[PDB]
């Protein structure tokens, strides 16, 4: 299972959430920004490690990080 982390530099744009193929990320209430929103990763057991979410992060450096880790058959995207 890959490990996805969200850092407090998140501006809560939600572009990454709208980018992920497997519905790993979510938007949750917060208070540290002007959107009162921040990204959560409650379902990283379905993360394929595609890292589309990182290419959609407009912060510098990124606020969403995907660390590839132990592989599952869910992680490897195998239909057989």
């Amino acid at each position: 299972s890959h490990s996805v982390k969200i850092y407090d530099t998140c501006i809560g744009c939600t572009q990454c959430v709208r980018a992920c193929p497997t519905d790993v990320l979510e938007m949750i209430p917060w208070g540290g920004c002007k959107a009162k929103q921040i990204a959560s990763a409650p379902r990283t057991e379905d993360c394929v490690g595609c890292k589309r979410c990182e290419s959609a992060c407009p912060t510098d450096f990124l606020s969403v990080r995907v660390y590839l880790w132990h592989e599952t058959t869910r992680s490897m995207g195998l239909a057989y």
Partner: protein
């Protein structure tokens, strides 16, 4: 009494994971709100690798320069 550098200032970046680290930028707006960890907003003259030219920073990460 406002917070951080004034609007339009010229601040040097100190966040070493930033593209413009040790470079300079122009302040655009610093929210007077507490409860925000990165109030300063800085615009640069050069895009980063993601083709982005503005970024938020905390008060300690910026340092007003001359």
């Amino acid at each position: 009494p406002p917070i951080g550098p004034k609007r339009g200032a010229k601040v040097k970046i100190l966040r070493q994971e930033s593209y413009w680290y040790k470079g300079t930028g122009s302040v655009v707006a610093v929210d007077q709100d507490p409860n925000t960890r990165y109030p300063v907003v800085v615009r640069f003259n050069k895009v980063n690798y993601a083709n982005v030219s503005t970024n938020n920073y905390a008060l300690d990460e910026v340092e007003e320069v001359k």
